[PDB]
Amino acid sequence: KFGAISSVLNDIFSRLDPPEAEVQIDRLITGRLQSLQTYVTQQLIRAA
Amino acid sequence: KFGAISSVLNDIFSRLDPPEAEVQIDRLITGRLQSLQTYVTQQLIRAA
Amino acid sequence: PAYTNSFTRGVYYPDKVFRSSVLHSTQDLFLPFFSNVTWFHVIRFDNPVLPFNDGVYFASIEKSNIIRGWIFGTTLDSKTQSLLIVNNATNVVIKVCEFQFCNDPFLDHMESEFRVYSSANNCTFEYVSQPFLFKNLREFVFKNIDGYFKIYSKHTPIIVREPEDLPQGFSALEPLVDLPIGINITRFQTLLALHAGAAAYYVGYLQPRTFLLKYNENGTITDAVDCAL
Amino acid sequence: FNATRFASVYAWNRKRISNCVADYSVLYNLFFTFKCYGVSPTKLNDLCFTNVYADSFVIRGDEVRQIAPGQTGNIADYNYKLPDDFTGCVIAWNSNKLDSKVSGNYNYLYRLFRKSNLKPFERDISQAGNKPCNGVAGFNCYFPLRSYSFRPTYGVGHQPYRVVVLSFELLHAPATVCGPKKSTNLVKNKCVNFNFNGLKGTGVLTESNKKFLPFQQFGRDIADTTDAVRDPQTL
Amino acid sequence: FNATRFASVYAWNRKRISNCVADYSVLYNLFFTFKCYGVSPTKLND
Ligand SMILES: *[C@@H]1O[C@H](CO)[C@@H](O)[C@H](O)[C@H]1NC(C)=O
Ligand SMILES: *[C@@H]1O[C@H](CO)[C@@H](O)[C@H](O)[C@H]1NC(C)=O
Ligand SMILES: *[C@@H]1O[C@H](CO)[C@@H](O)[C@H](O)[C@H]1NC(C)=O
Numbered sequence: 001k002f003g004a005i006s007s008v009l010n011d012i013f014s015r016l017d018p019p020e021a022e023v024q025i026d027r028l029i030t031g032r033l034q035s036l037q038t039y040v041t042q043q044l045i046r047a048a
Numbered sequence: 049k050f051g052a053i054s055s056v057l058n059d060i061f062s063r064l065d066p067p068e069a070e071v072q073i074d075r076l077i078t079g080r081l082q083s084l085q086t087y088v089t090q091q092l093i094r095a096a
Numbered sequence: 097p098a099y100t101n102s103f104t105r106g107v108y109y110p111d112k113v114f115r116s117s118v119l120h121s122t123q124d125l126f127l128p129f130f131s132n133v134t135w136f137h138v139i140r141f142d143n144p145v146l147p148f149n150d151g152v153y154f155a156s157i158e159k160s161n162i163i164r165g166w167i168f169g170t171t172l173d174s175k176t177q178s179l180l181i182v183n184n185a186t187n188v189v190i191k192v193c194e195f196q197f198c199n200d201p202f203l204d205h206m207e208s209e210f211r212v213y214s215s216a217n218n219c220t221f222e223y224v225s226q227p228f229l230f231k232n233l234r235e236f237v238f239k240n241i242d243g244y245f246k247i248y249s250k251h252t253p254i255i256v257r258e259p260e261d262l263p264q265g266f267s268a269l270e271p272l273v274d275l276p277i278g279i280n281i282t283r284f285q286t287l288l289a290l291h292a293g294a295a296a297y298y299v300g301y302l303q304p305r306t307f308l309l310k311y312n313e314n315g316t317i318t319d320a321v322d323c324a325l
Numbered sequence: 326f327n328a329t330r331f332a333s334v335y336a337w338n339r340k341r342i343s344n345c346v347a348d349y350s351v352l353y354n355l356f357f358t359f360k361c362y363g364v365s366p367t368k369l370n371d372l373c374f375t376n377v378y379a380d381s382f383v384i385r386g387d388e389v390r391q392i393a394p395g396q397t398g399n400i401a402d403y404n405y406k407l408p409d410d411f412t413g414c415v416i417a418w419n420s421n422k423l424d425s426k427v428s429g430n431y432n433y434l435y436r437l438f439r440k441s442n443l444k445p446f447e448r449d450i451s452q453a454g455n456k457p458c459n460g461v462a463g464f465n466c467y468f469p470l471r472s473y474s475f476r477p478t479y480g481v482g483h484q485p486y487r488v489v490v491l492s493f494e495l496l497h498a499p500a501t502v503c504g505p506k507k508s509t510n511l512v513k514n515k516c517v518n519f520n521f522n523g524l525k526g527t528g529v530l531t532e533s534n535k536k537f538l539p540f541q542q543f544g545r546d547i548a549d550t551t552d553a554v555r556d557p558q559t560l
Numbered sequence: 561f562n563a564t565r566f567a568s569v570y571a572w573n574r575k576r577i578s579n580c581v582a583d584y585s586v587l588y589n590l591f592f593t594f595k596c597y598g599v600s601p602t603k604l605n606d
């Protein structure tokens with residue numbers, strides 16, 4: 001969930017109003033980008 | 049924009065009140081620190 | 097109706113911030129490149145009603161300034177609010193009233209406004225400024241975004257070869273005026289100043305597309321590519 | 326603000342405000358609510374706005390919450406719809422001493438019913454189903470514009486509240502509206518803090534080869550940081 | 561929402577609402593405070 005109310009996107013868009021979601025989905029987006037940066041970094045190290 | 053209202057910092061200071069800005073500019077600092085950490089990680093892999 | 101091709105036209109400056117020697121990508125309502133646009137030729141008379149469809153690119157090739165202005169509105173009668181653009185030898189009148197238009201709003205025959213509108217109710221707008229308008233190609237882009245009417249204009253004379261063809265060249269349209277009309281522009285119709293003459297005008301509809309604009313030195317958009325073409 | 330005659334909510338009047346200094350301090354002096362979106366209220370004076378549009382209308386006290394971003398209601402969907410991302414203030418104050426009569430107020434009305442939801446910053450100055458109305462009242466037919474019938478004896482949530490909405494844009498155009506801030510003489514080829522049209526930065530200002538077209542007021546770098554500015558007092 | 565006598569805070573009344581379609585527009589009909597946690601007021605009818 002990355003500190004948000006839910007892991008999936010759709011209940012956060014259906015439950016919370018647009019200003020409140022833009023903080024929760026930004027928290028999910030930053031965390032998912034971090035996990036995907038961790039994966040790309042570990043793939044670069046193993047590729048080296 | 050990194051999930052903020054603008055990319056520039058001096059607008060966010062002038063347009064928004066000091067408590068309100070420290071929410072936008074903390075996001076901006078977190079995004080720019082993530083990008084800089086990505087640059088020092090990829091430069092370290094390229095240096096290896 | 098006859099259809100012709102827009103080869104690279106319809107590109108305007110998206111914002112009022114200089115950029116130079118920069119390839120900038122913008123996502124906005126633009127005219128798709130290589131798009132089929134309607135061609136109306138008048139010397140019966142072709143003065144039809146056309147829908148707006150969240151953006152209109154208007155281009156006109158003429159000599160005697162026959163195509164004077166446009167009307168914009170929802171149902172084009174006096175029950176609903178409507179816009180008007182009327183150009184003459186002195187100035188241009190952009191006027192948002194509740195006009196009762198005639199079926200053929202030919203300007204003048206001069207007979208002045210004549211049968212362009214019959215009555216004005218709850219008129220709230222009146223912008224009068226400098227007028228907007230061998231052959232002369234006059235290009236216009238109309239956008240109605242959040243109640244703001246944005247007009248982008250560019251004037252550049254063009255040659256003939258094949259008769260009445262849009263030119264194959266890149267010309268960026270400079271923003272001209274931004275109006276707080278606050279009306280619903282669903283349909284529109286051009287105005288023809290009937291009096292020996294010839295005129296032809298082109299209507300294209302904008303679509304939300306991503307454009308990569310090629311700013312160079314002197315700050316002019318000289319080239320652009322449609323991402324989804 | 327100090328006008329006896331205002332406008333009905335369905336036909337709200339929007340007032341263009343430009344080419345003048347706006348001292349928001351006078352409004353703060355005036356019983357009033359100053360909730361602002363996009364700009365916080367205190368910071369308005371040290372800013373320059375492109376154009377200031379005043380949307381003046383009269384509603385009830387419980388319908389002030391309908392005039393909001395992302396808000397659905399009667400007044401919001403059928404009379405006056407606000408955008409989700411505007412930049413401006415909503416000002417509401419009780420004026421039952423000027424907008425309430427004993428018999429009622431037929432000067433101000435509201436559109437009760439409409440066919441579809443109304444798009445933001447738009448104004449409608451113009452049949453539920455079954456039989457057509459054909460310009461007359463009948464079954465499933467209504468005169469959409471209904472009167473507010475204000476009285477001084479009503480409750481506070483039903484008292485006449487006068488709402489003006491000040492909308493503007495920021496750093497996207499040459500700013501016709503600016504705060505009452507005293508000017509400072511321009512020096513070039515020096516490291517100086519600068520406040521051009523509400524843009525604050527510390528930089529060395531030099532003559533620039535770039536020829537800005539009349540619409541362009543600012544020049545942006547590939548990092549979206551202003552790299553050139555056109556001086557407002559001297560172009 | 562409408563009772564001749566609401567319950568006291570020490571012994572609050574808990575009413576189970578189920579097996580029905582709930583429209584939350586009616587609530588706003590009755591100075592109204594409507595603070596929602598975990599959800600927003602407009603999205604309830606969805
Ligand atoms: C455009 O019109 C021409 C002739 O009217 C036709 O040949 C062509 O196929 C059309 N293009 C599209 C994409 O429909
Ligand atoms: C052009 O239109 C303006 C606007 O009404 C009018 O004042 C002016 O006399 C007109 N000029 C002509 C008809 O030459
Ligand atoms: C830019 O301006 C210079 C004038 O110094 C001119 O020589 C040059 O042709 C211009 N470039 C374009 C693409 O128009």
Ligand SMILES: *[C@@H]1O[C@H](CO)[C@@H](O)[C@H](O)[C@H]1NC(C)=O
Nearest residue numbers: 170280282441442443444447
């Ligand atoms: C504009 O008018 C059309 C007419 O069909 C109406 O259906 C629509 O709701 C209105 N839309 C806007 C942009 O308000």
Ligand SMILES: *[C@@H]1O[C@H](CO)[C@@H](O)[C@H](O)[C@H]1NC(C)=O
Nearest residue numbers: 508509510556557558559560
């Ligand atoms: C006021 O500003 C204008 C800008 O158009 C400038 O031409 C003029 O000299 C200025 N006047 C003074 C007294 O500063």
